[PDB]
Amino acid sequence: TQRRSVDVSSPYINLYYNRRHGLPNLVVEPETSYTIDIMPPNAYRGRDRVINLPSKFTHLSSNKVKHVIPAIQWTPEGRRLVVATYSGEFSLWNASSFTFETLMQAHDSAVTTMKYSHDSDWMISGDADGMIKIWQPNFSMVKEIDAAHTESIRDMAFSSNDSKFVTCSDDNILKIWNFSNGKQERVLSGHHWDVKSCDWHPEMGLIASASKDNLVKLWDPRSGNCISSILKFKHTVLKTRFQPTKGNLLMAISKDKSCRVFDIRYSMKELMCVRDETDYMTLEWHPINESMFTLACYDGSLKHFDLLQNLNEPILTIPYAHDKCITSLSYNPVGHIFATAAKDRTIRFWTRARPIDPNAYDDPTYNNKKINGWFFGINNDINA
Amino acid sequence: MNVYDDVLDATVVSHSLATHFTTSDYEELLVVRTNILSVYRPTRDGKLYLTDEFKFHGLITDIGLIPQKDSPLSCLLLCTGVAKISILKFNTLTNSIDTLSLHYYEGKFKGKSLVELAKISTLRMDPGSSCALLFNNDIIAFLPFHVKFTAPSVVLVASELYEGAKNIIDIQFLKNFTKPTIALLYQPKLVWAGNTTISKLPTQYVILTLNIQPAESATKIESTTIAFVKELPWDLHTIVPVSNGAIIVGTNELAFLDNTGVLQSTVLLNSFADKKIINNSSLEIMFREKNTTSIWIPSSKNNDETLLLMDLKSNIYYIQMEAELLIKFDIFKLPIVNDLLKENSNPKCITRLNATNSNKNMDLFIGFGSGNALVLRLNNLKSPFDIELLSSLRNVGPITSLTVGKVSSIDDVVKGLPNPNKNEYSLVATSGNGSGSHLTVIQTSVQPEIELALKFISITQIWNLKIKGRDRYLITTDSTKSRSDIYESDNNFKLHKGGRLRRDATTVYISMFGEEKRIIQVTTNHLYLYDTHFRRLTTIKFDYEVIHVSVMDPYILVTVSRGDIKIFELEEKNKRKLLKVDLPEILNEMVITSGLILKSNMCNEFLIGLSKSQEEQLLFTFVTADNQIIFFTKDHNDRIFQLNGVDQLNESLYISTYQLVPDPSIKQVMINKLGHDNKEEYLTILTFGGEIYQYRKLPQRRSRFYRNVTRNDLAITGAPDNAYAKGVSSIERIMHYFPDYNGYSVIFVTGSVPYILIKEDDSTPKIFKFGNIPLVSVTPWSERSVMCVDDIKNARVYTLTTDNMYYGNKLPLKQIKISNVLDDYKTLQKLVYHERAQLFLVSYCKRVPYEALGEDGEKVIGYDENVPHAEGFQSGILLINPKSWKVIDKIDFPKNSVVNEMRSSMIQINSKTKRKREYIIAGVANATTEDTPPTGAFHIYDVIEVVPEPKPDTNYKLKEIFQEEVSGTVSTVCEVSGRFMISQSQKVLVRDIQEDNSVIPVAFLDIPVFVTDSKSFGNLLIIGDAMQGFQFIGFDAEPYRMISLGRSMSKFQTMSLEFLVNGGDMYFAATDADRNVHVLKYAPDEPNSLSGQRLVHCSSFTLHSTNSCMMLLPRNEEFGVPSFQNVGGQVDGSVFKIVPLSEEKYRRLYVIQQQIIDRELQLGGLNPRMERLANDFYQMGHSMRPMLDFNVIRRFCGLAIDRRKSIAQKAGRHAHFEAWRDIINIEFSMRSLCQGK
Amino acid sequence: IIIQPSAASKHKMFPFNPAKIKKDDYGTVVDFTMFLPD
Amino acid sequence: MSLIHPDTAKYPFKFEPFLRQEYSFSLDPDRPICEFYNSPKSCPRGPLCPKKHVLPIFQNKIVCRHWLRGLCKKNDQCEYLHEYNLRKMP
């Protein structure tokens, strides 16, 4: 029973052989034998960052009980993908072979968000009744604080040092917690309506939030007062994310169908304003290459953007990446797998493109002709 | 608390250019290895003679040329680090390079960069000498130059020049323009091999004329677009400007674009391209590198413009260009008949050496990455041709592995006498990539070849005479019993049975005299003058005992106990006279410690009657008690000269007139020619502390001597203020000069630790340890040989090995070629030494085309059999006996299998009796694509004595102990307390051993991404991760476990790991892909360490090249729990060591280093602190405990005595003493290899 | 950027004095007015 | 005194008492069983005892499938053996 395996081991062997002997990274040629020369995604930067684009569809997975997936998340080293269910269970899925059925019954209500620590030693998960559970990498209880928020937890993020983490819920209130004991620290009092997302700056102490008040606010993890606010969205801002590696950028998507990128280096300098006909649902920066991110629309239609290539249009559009609106995007921390979840109760995985494959950008994902993942082969490229 | 030193200097040539930099008399060649800029004089016959060498504190990334007004010397433009430009000028008055202007574009680049900057910026120079642009990526910094100041303010723009420019691939200045016009190659939409089927022809090209408008306060540039091209192939990466336009060298197409911006013709290379004049070629060549090295040569007088391209496999291609619109655009390959480029791969630079006033009969200097740099002669260029090797700069390629073993010291006795280098181990490293890969032995000392080992002929000191150069009368002496013997060296011996010698007094000196027609013997209190038949003729009674004798043909100089100077001259008429020679009256007043007769032309400008560089004058050189060197000629006329500055050992010396505090540091001086074929006059000074100082006489202005302090090439052998007294106390150190050792003019320094000074033609003189036994007396023997007598009365005749020995690079290098013409093992790696069997084991890594097969037997669909493929792997293990350096046994491995790690390990077979056997364990990983499950295997081998072939040294065989194929690539192998731990895909497994060769796993752990390296210190382990640093693991035995003790808080792509234990504490050394060296320690007591689970970052030290391997080696404690040090090999060919320090030693060396940085002047305006600590990890470790650079501290020894004393006064009272002590200790840290077993 | 005159000793170098970036548990304390939307 | 395989098994590390107090780890892997520990104060020498102590998790006879996959909810209270020996795999 030979399944499909996507492991970055042999590419890393090749990369370190080239690196230790001083050999250059040979340019990949459009042929099958040159896939061995496709370096791991962390090896590519600058011009050849286009090789890291998750353009290929490689696996469609769905659990036995087809619940609705409110959030997905990768393990910090990318071994397994943690899929939250409406019933409050952690469904794990191995990254190498995308197969598992490990129900865990994590929460009682619907798990709405999970977040892993930067040191890969802890996980926090919130649910629909404002309960935060702090987990261990082996998925054991470490702390179960009840009613940390009134309504459903929307988003939460760790600090750089992982001793603190901010959370947001359907309320108009953000809170800071000392991660060591879950002590209730200062409350980010402010905002007018239903904060929808929150994020922590990767290096600096800086909190970014999005609410229904048509405002993106920058907060203070120490003073606890709104240090700045962005008034450039004409409707509720669905999500905000800093650039994970450097943090020099900050995205935000609103219900006015506009995505804006702000350069925090020069007084909230706006760099992009892309307006679509379909609603943006969720966003995700690339974990390795900056200036690269993916936007998920209300009709599927995964859109990959590049700040250095185009400031008005996406550099790659997968118009039918999902049957219904895409609700969760997750990048493998290794960067070789992209995981997307939508309201069709399915989980789809995306990998980097191959030098030559017959489907290319023409498949039941790029066009509409049934759907399948061909889970019976021994390769990535499928003939015809 | 660690210090960084360069055991080996870098030897891969990365940049090269020709100009008039140091002088305008000849066309110089500038060679940049990694941080060393060397100035060479290419001879007529293609040899490279070094004239000046400089070492910079940062990695030199580019070198540029610009000419200054009213001067024939071109100013040097140095580009180091990231986005840096420094103007360098040569000051012939001081014979040193000085800095004219600095330009720091890094901060301004980051201020308008959306993403992280590229590692190295690229410098472009216009062929008009008006401006220079340094572009990193998407951002161009412009440096204009005046046609007052020499460079106006710098202005940088990203895409303000042309709106279209989005993703710049290459920028080049264009030729034949009255204004600075540049050409830009950029891809607004990025396309790779997977994007070729959606977006077609995404590369764009534009030519911009720049209106450089320098101003007093700023600089503005108004750009006018000359032309514009829209559709160009995706794989274009290089722009090669020519007279009529430019050549766009792509991975598969060459596109010619003129100065009007119209594509004329395109030449296809491989079957990997398709669709406007398209010239098709089936020659499957590929420019798969990002940058393709090439040399463009303008026409002579005539119309002959040639462009030579280069291939990663060191192929040269010829591009013809002729025009009336350009016609006949094509590509041709020039053949190599004698495959002299077979061992050379990855060329980096090409430079034309000799003008010749034509484009035929060329002289090319080409730097390479794997093989040695070659000077090539190309006689006739055609579309007969031939090539030849004129010179070579020894390159040890990328050091890919390191281990200690026995190369010398293998035999306990040689030629019936004990081995002169017994109990001595050496560092053996694998070198190069591919066909030229070999073994490089980094010798800790010079191993001398033995030709005669006669016993007990000397007691105290010998003298070998030459009646006609026939080795007669090897006179010996007995300083204890006051006896002297004659002996016959013509296979007679048993003394001469009477030859009218004294024989009853301590002979002080004896040598041939008067054109070998006389023999003069100076005993303790008497002087004699014999003949060839040894009949005594004249006797001069010395009322005072002699303590120094120097002899030239006419004169003999004798120095006595009160210091009286007596110089006698042989009478050329009938001899037997020995007339006295008059001396200046000042000589009576001054006190002299030592003296010698000398022959030099350094006074040929003050002496009356001659001002010619030739005709070196005979001089009487004397060293005073105030460390002053004085000298005078025969017809002195009471004129006494002196070398000014020797007393303070200044960086520069010159001839003057002597002008009238005894601290006799200087013990012996020597002025003689040193070198192999290009002999240069050098002034060598021996101190009573045993240290050796050297000076170089410039061929022009011969009255001046200079020393290089920036170049750390002279090894430290002693200390001034009685520190390291153990090097001179036992055996007196005397420098003996030999103009012909093996064709080399060397200097032998005797003592308990002997030294030899050897200078190669392409390098500065180097001081090498000579053997591993004490040396008492050395005399010339035969022709090109010496006789050496040790402290145990043994006598040995020595010869200098030359076959595969290089005597530069701070340590002798022996090249061991394991692959012959019969079998070529290609690149060698993971070399180990079997201690019990005294054998060396290596792994070959022959490259083969890769076939992408599925999980079943079939291959994947998209394979093309009509197309060239990518490279795979096929490895094995070789058994090599160091006695003959020959392969005894070889074992092969299946396809795609690469040995990622071999380790001769001490495996504990029995848990009860604790028995251990040194098996060999190899970690084999199957190198495949990402679309197949990882698989691998591990093998365990025994080395068992067998009956040799009816050929010696064939008595050992490789016997498999265990063998198993596992799931997941095996990337590392490590033994933990008798059990070997190997790494699978995201797992590490420990397996035990029983007597029945039964292997069973006992514990396991999960690793984040990929295991890059693994080391064990007892039952502790460190496992490096390709993305998230490394982790600390402890292993327990009875219940087997893999407790995770900590992880590095900083995620980086670690390359190699090792332990820097440093006494009671413990530290880890990690190297990243960013050329950084990270020191982390397991600190479980600090409050912020999370009880040890977080490894605290201590220091981040930026290296000048990528680290490939790291080893643990014991430290040699010269004065003072075992100590260890790390030794690492580098891609550029250098070897470095990290020597852990104590607290007091570290404080002393840190204060010395900061005082050197502040007080002293750095070469090219390079701050070592910013060359090393200015990385992405600067705000992570301790600010006041950085990694120390011994190269910076090495400059402490090069200062004047007063300045050296003042420097140590910054911290500590007697800081000079202990500072010299620990500097010596660090210098001799690797001498633990000299005392093995 | 820098013109090299012959008067000093350590000023003929590239300056290197990066200000120590104070970083607490919450992150690096930075100027909090430079984020003004302007 | 071997350069090739330097003696590293017995080295005076300053974190030995910490490595023994927690994780019950000693720099000597092959040390004799304490034979005075029951399964916390049974050891007369206490936690700082060179002889090896054994947690009750290590006396079980069946390895834990959840521990093999790294998903064992019970850290040390698990009734299955948390040790990788192929002899007693379920």
Residue numbers in the entry:
A (entry chain D): 28 to 411
B (entry chain A): 1 to 147, 193 to 320, 326 to 351, 358 to 380, 383 to 441, 496 to 772, 777 to 1066, 1068 to 1237, ...
C (entry chain C): 524 to 561
D (entry chain B): 1 to 39, 43 to 93
Give the exact sentences the study uses for this entry:
Most eukaryotic messenger RNAs (mRNAs) are processed at their 3′ end by the cleavage and polyadenylation specificity factor (CPF/CPSF). CPF mediates the endonucleolytic cleavage of the pre-mRNA and addition of a polyadenosine (poly(A)) tail, which together define the 3′ end of the mature transcript. In the yeast Saccharomyces cerevisiae, CPF is assembled into a 14-subunit (∼850 kDa) complex, which is organized into three enzymatically distinct and interconnected modules: the polymerase, nuclease, and phosphatase modules (Casañal et al., 2017). The nuclease module contains the endonuclease Ysh1, the pseudo-nuclease Cft2, and the multidomain protein Mpe1 (orthologs of human CPSF73, CPSF100, and RBBP6, respectively).
